[PDB]
Amino acid sequence: ALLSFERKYRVPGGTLVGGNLFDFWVGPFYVGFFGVATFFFAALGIILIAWSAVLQGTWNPQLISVYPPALEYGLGGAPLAKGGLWQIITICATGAFVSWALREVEICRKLGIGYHIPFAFAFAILAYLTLVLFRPVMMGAWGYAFPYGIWTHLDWVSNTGYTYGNFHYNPAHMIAITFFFTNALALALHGALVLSAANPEKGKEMRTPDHEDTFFRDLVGYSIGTLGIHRLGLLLSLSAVFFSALCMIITGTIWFDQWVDWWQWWVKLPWWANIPGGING
Amino acid sequence: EYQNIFTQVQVRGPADLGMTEDVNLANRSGVGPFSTLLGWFGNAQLGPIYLGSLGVLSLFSGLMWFFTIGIWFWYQAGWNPAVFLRDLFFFSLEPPAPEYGLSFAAPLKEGGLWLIASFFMFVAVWSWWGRTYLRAQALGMGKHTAWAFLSAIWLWMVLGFIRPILMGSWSEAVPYGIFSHLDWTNNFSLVHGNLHYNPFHGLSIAFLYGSALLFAMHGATILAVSRFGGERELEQIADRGTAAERAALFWRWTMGFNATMEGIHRWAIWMAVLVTLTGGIGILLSGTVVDNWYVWGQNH
Amino acid sequence: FDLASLAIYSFWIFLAGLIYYLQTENMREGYPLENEDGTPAANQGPFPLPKPKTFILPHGRGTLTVPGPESEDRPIALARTAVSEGFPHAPTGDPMKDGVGPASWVARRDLPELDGHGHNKIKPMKAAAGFHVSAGKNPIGLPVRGCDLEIAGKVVDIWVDIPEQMARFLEVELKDGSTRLLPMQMVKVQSNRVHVNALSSDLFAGIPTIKSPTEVTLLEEDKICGYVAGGLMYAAPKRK
Numbered sequence A: 001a002l003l004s005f006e007r008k009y010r011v012p013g014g015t016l017v018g019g020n021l022f023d024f025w026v027g028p029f030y031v032g033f034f035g036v037a038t039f040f041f042a043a044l045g046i047i048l049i050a051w052s053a054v055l056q057g058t059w060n061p062q063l064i065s066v067y068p069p070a071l072e073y074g075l076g077g078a079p080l081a082k083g084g085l086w087q088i089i090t091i092c093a094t095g096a097f098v099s100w101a102l103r104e105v106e107i108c109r110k111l112g113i114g115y116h117i118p119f120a121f122a123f124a125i126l127a128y129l130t131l132v133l134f135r136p137v138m139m140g141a142w143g144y145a146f147p148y149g150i151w152t153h154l155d156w157v158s159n160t161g162y163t164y165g166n167f168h169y170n171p172a173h174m175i176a177i178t179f180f181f182t183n184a185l186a187l188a189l190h191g192a193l194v195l196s197a198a199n200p201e202k203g204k205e206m207r208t209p210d211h212e213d214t215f216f217r218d219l220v221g222y223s224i225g226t227l228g229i230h231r232l233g234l235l236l237s238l239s240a241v242f243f244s245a246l247c248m249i250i251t252g253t254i255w256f257d258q259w260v261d262w263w264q265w266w267v268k269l270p271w272w273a274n275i276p277g278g279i280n281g
Numbered sequence B: 001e002y003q004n005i006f007t008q009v010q011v012r013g014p015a016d017l018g019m020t021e022d023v024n025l026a027n028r029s030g031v032g033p034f035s036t037l038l039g040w041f042g043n044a045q046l047g048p049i050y051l052g053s054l055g056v057l058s059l060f061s062g063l064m065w066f067f068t069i070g071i072w073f074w075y076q077a078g079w080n081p082a083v084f085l086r087d088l089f090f091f092s093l094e095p096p097a098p099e100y101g102l103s104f105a106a107p108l109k110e111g112g113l114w115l116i117a118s119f120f121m122f123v124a125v126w127s128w129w130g131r132t133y134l135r136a137q138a139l140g141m142g143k144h145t146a147w148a149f150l151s152a153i154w155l156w157m158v159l160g161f162i163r164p165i166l167m168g169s170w171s172e173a174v175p176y177g178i179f180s181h182l183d184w185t186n187n188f189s190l191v192h193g194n195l196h197y198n199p200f201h202g203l204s205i206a207f208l209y210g211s212a213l214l215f216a217m218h219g220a221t222i223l224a225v226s227r228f229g230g231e232r233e234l235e236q237i238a239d240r241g242t243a244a245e246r247a248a249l250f251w252r253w254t255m256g257f258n259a260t261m262e263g264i265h266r267w268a269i270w271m272a273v274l275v276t277l278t279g280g281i282g283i284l285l286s287g288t289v290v291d292n293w294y295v296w297g298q299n300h
Numbered sequence C: 001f002d003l004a005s006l007a008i009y010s011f012w013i014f015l016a017g018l019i020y021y022l023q024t025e026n027m028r029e030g031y032p033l034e035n036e037d038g039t040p041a042a043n044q045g046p047f048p049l050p051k052p053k054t055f056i057l058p059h060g061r062g063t064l065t066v067p068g069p070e071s072e073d074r075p076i077a078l079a080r081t082a083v084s085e086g087f088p089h090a091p092t093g094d095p096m097k098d099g100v101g102p103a104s105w106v107a108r109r110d111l112p113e114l115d116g117h118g119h120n121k122i123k124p125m126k127a128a129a130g131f132h133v134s135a136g137k138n139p140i141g142l143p144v145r146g147c148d149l150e151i152a153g154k155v156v157d158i159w160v161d162i163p164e165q166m167a168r169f170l171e172v173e174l175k176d177g178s179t180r181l182l183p184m185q186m187v188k189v190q191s192n193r194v195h196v197n198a199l200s201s202d203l204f205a206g207i208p209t210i211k212s213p214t215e216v217t218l219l220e221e222d223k224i225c226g227y228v229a230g231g232l233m234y235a236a237p238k239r240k
């Protein structure tokens, strides 16, 4: 079925591979070559998860956990049950994520819109590969990657973080958090502002964008504008994820001590480093 | 191809003094200078700003809070400017000790000053909340901003006021300090058996992540259809254009369903407020109802 | 059945109702779903259509009630390519002129968008008292080059979003003396020229014209922007 205004857009063309062979829809979903590839990787990866569940001995989704190979395996291959499934499932997940992004690109072309969406999705893919590929490789073992389990992968975050004391002190970690908090802050303000203008007080006619500008100038003396807030929201969310991958790719590769120690260069500058008093004196 | 991340050609005209409606124009400043810097990313105009009783009260009360923490840091620094800059992030204004309970009779150097600072912060935040309400009201707008703000206040109220009272001790509140409040966050989880296994904490994370997910989708979507004037969302709501249609169809073809130009902003406001809404619940239940979240989790 | 268990169970119930509410709210446009012949589709999903809401539009522009009877209010020059559903509908004529596919436009009101004071939101800079180029390259006077690397005209004015203080269109003078508007988001201002990768020099004349030299309507904006974006797919054969 279609939306009332959808038919005029369902024209042929825009594909990157296969011409018109996969240029069609299944219900609302557009297929395309990379829709087929996505389905292929996704189906295969899910079969390997089910197969790992059988080896594990449970069909409870809360317990299923596919672990990477032990550290002793280094960066070589491992038997399916002893880390190989994680390796293959990681290959399929990458194929699915990348196929998904290229499918979005084909949809941008058919609709004549910009490519901002798949470009933003690629930052999320980057963060995934930072944890399962880049950081393990640089450290020299797939075992440093995280396990595929609802709860076991939270334990990995806790074990990895506390290996370096309080991970809070990772300075790139602080920056990434600031963008996550600021992003949610900006998202709430933006959603609230449009709704407040489209849904004014009772007995009032719909507001204009000038009211949105005026409201924020009255509130904090500046309005970024209708275009600027969408630029901002894109930048806040991508910067948050960028510094996330940054704060981890440096952990265990060029930094190995507790992250609080990193802040010593400031405290122990030879001039004020010895002045008695204060917290550090 | 031009991507519309930075303005190519800035244009500038007479300053926009803004809509009037029922705003008391006596409390509006003049217009500030234009910022070519900001003009590359958004609007270049600074000001005017509205400055009423609440704003004055909020700003003053807020600076008192800032100054109170300040003189304490200078005092911890022995009034030495060098030590002040060295140990700036290590200074901390802690709440009263547990023995004082919920009493305000703690001497200034043993939590009395933390109580004074919290009072100023309390007045500054709440008077600012009333500000977000009256500014919308003066322009005949909905109060979505004020209600969304309550969600953030909810968590802040739980961390420093509501939960400590229910626990019966101001010592359960958060200290004022850069590093000190990070450490407080760390000890809080360890004491309560790993917050990872607090379900409201996991829910809060899903919405924090989901907020970055949704705003990246929405920001990218509006820029991709800005070639059709898609960022003029209020008129797209009143008169759907090809921008709104292409935006909806991209996501329908991608994941099977879609939003409207208005409806996406209800997804956005709820995705964001749910972060601090669920978070405040998770913290409020920690120590009051559940001492160990990991253990509590194993029984459910 | 401790208070924590009841809170988390209560929340999940609240979240299900919230999602049901959010999804129905996002069905105020484009629904009910149609078959490819225009008839109502048999399967409309599990979520029902929301009850109508009314916006009172400012400046005496009337009221909008959504959801309501939908209409394209324009012909669609396409035709099925398959008896079964889910396949592309092929243009029957010239898709850029017929405004289909990436060249699509919506039958918006043939009126200009207004600002909070009831004045035209978009105006040519020659009619905008006080507005000027404050940073970056001033494109006025520059030649405009198409994807075929041929010149189509020269920029003669900038149409500005006055409330936002933002450039939205370049008014380009064609070799025949007439002018056209070009979305600001589809041009590339360079040191010595303006480059438009979406169109070839001989497709600029096909851009829809406006009926007033000092204002542009929402309908005109959609026809202009759709035509230019449509060039990316349909002007590609002569894209060097």
Ligand code: BCL
Residues within 6 Å of the ligand: A097, A124, A125, A126, A127, A128, A130, A131, A156, A157, A158, A159, A160, A161, A162, A166, A167, A168, A173, A176, A177, A180, A240, A241, A243, A244, A245, A246, A247, A248, B185
């Ligand atoms: C005890 C634990 C430690 C700690 C240790 C760590 C460690 C270790 C790490 C972080 C990382 C992060 N931490 Mg920390 N962290 C702590 C405390 C905090 C606090 C806090 C208030 O106390 C905060 C706010 C944060 C914040 C954050 C973020 C900056 C970051 C996670 C986001 C991210 O990278 O997303 C990135 C986004 C993704 C990976 C998503 C990718 C999605 C892919 C592309 C697609 C999936 C498709 C899906 C399967 C399909 C499903 C289809 C169905 C239809 C649904 N941490 C404490 C001190 N933190 C992580 C980080 O930076 O990672 C890079 C990290 O590894």
Ligand code: BCL
Residues within 6 Å of the ligand: A046, A049, A128, A131, A146, A150, A151, A153, A154, A157, B196, B201, B202, B203, B205, B206, B207, B209, B210, B213
């Ligand atoms: C980012 C830094 C850390 C990390 C730290 C944390 C922490 C800390 C928490 C989570 C939480 C979650 N994480 Mg994790 N997580 C990481 C990497 C991942 C990846 C991945 C492919 O990289 C995935 C798919 C997940 C998935 C999940 C969910 C089970 C859950 C809710 C997230 C959410 O809604 O996000 C925002 C996205 C949306 C709102 C959109 C919808 C996405 C849905 C929910 C995805 C479901 C995935 C499904 C269960 C797995 C695939 C199924 C396949 C069919 C096999 N994590 C890395 C290693 N994650 C929380 C939780 O409750 O865990 C139990 C939690 O507390």
Ligand code: BCL
Residues within 6 Å of the ligand: A157, A181, A184, B125, B152, B153, B155, B156, B159, B184, B185, B186, B187, B188, B189, B190, B194, B195, B196, B200, B201, B204, B205, B208, B275, B276, B278, B279, B280, B282, B283
């Ligand atoms: C040891 C570390 C613990 C842990 C301990 C805690 C604790 C403790 C808390 C959190 C909280 C949060 N944690 Mg945790 N957290 C851990 C691991 C993680 C990981 C991870 C990757 O593993 C992630 C992604 C998170 C993520 C999160 C967030 C979802 C949540 C904060 C929401 C928010 O927006 O607060 C930011 C927003 C606010 C604080 C609201 C404040 C708004 C006020 C009104 C504004 C102040 C205005 C002021 C006057 C302005 C001027 C200030 C100047 C800047 C100085 N945590 C581990 C398990 N986490 C909080 C929560 O809700 O938990 C359920 C919380 O209290």
Ligand SMILES: CC[C@H]1c2cc3[nH]c4c(c3C)C(=O)[C@H](C(=O)OC)c4c3nc(cc4[nH]c(cc(n2)[C@@H]1C)c(C(C)=O)c4C)[C@@H](C)[C@@H]3CCC(=O)OC/C=C(\C)CCC[C@H](C)CCC[C@H](C)CCCC(C)C
Residues within 6 Å of the ligand: A038, A041, A042, A043, A044, A045, A046, A089, A092, A093, A096, A097, A100, A104, A117, A118, A120, A121, A123, A124, A147, A148, A149, A150, A153, A237, A238, A241, B209, B210, B212, B213, B216, B217, B220, B254, B255
């Ligand atoms: C980069 C900024 C933020 C962001 C942006 C972003 N995400 C995006 C996009 C964008 C712009 C899309 O366009 C795309 C989309 O279509 O969204 C609706 C997407 C998307 N972000 C998603 C999830 C997601 N994003 C996240 C984060 C973020 N996304 C960032 C915060 C997170 C987390 C944890 O924070 C998650 C969970 C999906 C809903 C969607 C991508 C869907 C996709 O790729 O589909 C193809 C894949 C499948 C259909 C299934 C693959 C199955 C695998 C073969 C097996 C599973 C292996 C996996 C490792 C299991 C591990 C589970 C455990 C860890 C629990």
Ligand SMILES: COC1=C(OC)C(=O)C(C/C=C(\C)CC/C=C(\C)CC/C=C(\C)CC/C=C(\C)CC/C=C(\C)CC/C=C(\C)CCC=C(C)C)=C(C)C1=O
Residues within 6 Å of the ligand: A026, A029, A030, A031, A034, A035, A036, A038, A039, B213, B214, B217, B218, B219, B221, B222, B244, B247, B248, B249, B251, B252, B254, B255, B256, B257, B258, B259, B260, B261, B264, B267
């Ligand atoms: C203003 O402009 C905008 C819109 O229009 C006006 C929008 O509409 C949206 C979309 C946003 C929403 C609808 C909000 C809800 C989304 C959320 C909360 C994000 C979280 C999303 C989800 C949890 C959904 C995830 C769903 C999927 C990944 C789909 C599942 C995948 C399947 C079924 C497979 C896909 C199909 C194929 C690969 C092809 C089929 C293959 C064959 C072999 C046949 C945005 C951003 C926007 O700015």
Ligand SMILES: COC(C)(C)C(=O)C/C=C(\C)CC/C=C(\C)CC/C=C(\C)CCCC/C(C)=C/CC[C@H](C)CC/C=C(\C)CCC=C(C)C
Residues within 6 Å of the ligand: B066, B067, B069, B070, B071, B073, B074, B115, B118, B119, B120, B121, B122, B156, B157, B158, B159, B160, B161, B162, B170, B173, B174, B175, B176, B177, B178, B181
């Ligand atoms: C030159 O330097 C001078 C001295 C001029 C300065 O000004 C320098 C000053 C600074 C550098 C200040 C630096 C500031 C900080 C480090 C602040 C850090 C803040 C945080 C980490 C956030 C902590 C907030 C959490 C809490 C606990 C908030 C309390 C809120 C409560 C809801 C209020 C509780 C109220 C109480 C107890 C009583 C008051 C009265 C009532 C009726 C409620």
Ligand SMILES: CCCCCCCC/C=C\CCCCCCCC(=O)OC[C@H](O)CO
Residues within 6 Å of the ligand: A182, A185, A186, A189, A190, A191, A193, A194, A209, A212, A213, A216, A220, A221, A222, A223, A224, A225, A226, A229
């Ligand atoms: C130069 C002085 C600036 C003072 C800033 C105070 C601190 C705000 C911090 C973060 C939120 C980001 C603000 C942007 C939120 C705007 C939400 C929105 O949608 O705005 C659209 C536009 O502003 C209307 O048309």
Ligand SMILES: CCCCCCCCCCCC[N+](C)(C)[O-]
Residues within 6 Å of the ligand: A098, A101, A102, A105, A115, A116, A118, A119, A122, A125, B003
């Ligand atoms: C990992 C797969 C990568 C696919 C991403 C393809 C998107 C192309 C983005 C080009 C334009 C991006 N931007 C931000 C400059 O507009």
Ligand SMILES: CCCCCCCCCCCC[N+](C)(C)[O-]
Residues within 6 Å of the ligand: B104, B105, B106, B107, B108, B112, B113, B115, B116, B119
């Ligand atoms: C400025 C008044 C508001 C502050 C509210 C909290 C009371 C502060 C108590 C300070 C300590 C006083 N005393 C006598 C116990 O030392």
Ligand SMILES: CCCCCCCCCCCC[N+](C)(C)[O-]
Residues within 6 Å of the ligand: A199, A200, A201, B141, B142, B143, B144, B147, B148, B150, B151, B269, B273
């Ligand atoms: C604490 C969560 C608050 C809910 C956030 C969503 C806002 C919806 C409320 C609509 C406001 C209606 N009104 C009439 C005041 O404008």
Ligand SMILES: CCCCCCCCCCCC[N+](C)(C)[O-]
Residues within 6 Å of the ligand: B198, B199, B200, B202, B203, B206, B210, B270, B271
């Ligand atoms: C408004 C958007 C709704 C998004 C809902 C996302 C649900 C994520 C599930 C997180 C699991 C949390 N829990 C309870 C298992 O700890």
Ligand SMILES: CCCCCCCCCCCC[N+](C)(C)[O-]
Residues within 6 Å of the ligand: A027, A028, B255, B256, B257, C045
């Ligand atoms: C946990 C998140 C769940 C999101 C799943 C969304 C499914 C895609 C939408 C289905 C609509 C298509 N169909 C075939 C049912 O009509």
Ligand SMILES: CCCCCCCCCCCC[N+](C)(C)[O-]
Residues within 6 Å of the ligand: B277, C006, C007, C008, C010, C011, C014
């Ligand atoms: C036994 C009751 C426990 C309460 C658990 C929380 C359930 C409701 C939470 C949603 C709050 C609703 N609100 C205020 C956002 O409209």
Ligand SMILES: CCCCCCCCCCCC[N+](C)(C)[O-]
Residues within 6 Å of the ligand: C013, C014, C016, C017, C018, C021
């Ligand atoms: C399955 C029924 C569950 C009912 C729980 C209540 C959910 C309602 C969500 C809020 C509705 C939106 N609103 C009007 C408050 O903005």
Ligand SMILES: CCCCCCCCCCCC[N+](C)(C)[O-]
Residues within 6 Å of the ligand: A028, B256, B257, C019, C023, C033, C044, C045, C046, C047
């Ligand atoms: C975490 C977000 C999950 C939201 C999923 C709910 C949306 C369901 C989509 C309904 C299908 C729409 N349709 C096919 C009838 O047009």
Ligand SMILES: [Fe+3]
Residues within 6 Å of the ligand: A190, A194, A230, B218, B222, B233, B265
């Ligand atoms: Fe928007």
